[PDB]
Amino acid sequence: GSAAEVMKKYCSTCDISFNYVKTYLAHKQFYHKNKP
Numbered sequence: 608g609s610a611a612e613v614m615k616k617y618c619s620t621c622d623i624s625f626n627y628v629k630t631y632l633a634h635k636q637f638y639h640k641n642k643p
């Protein structure tokens with residue numbers, strides 16, 4: 608699922624897509640990280 612080199616700009620958990628790696632990062636840091 609991770610810790611290697613999987614996925615790119617799409618969330619399998621939220622079934623969402625991103626046209627920019629920056630967005631996929633912002634989603635993981637914002638959506639899956641609301642208290643870093």
Ligand SMILES: [Zn+2]
Pocket residue numbers: 618619620621622623634638639
């Ligand atoms: Zn997600």
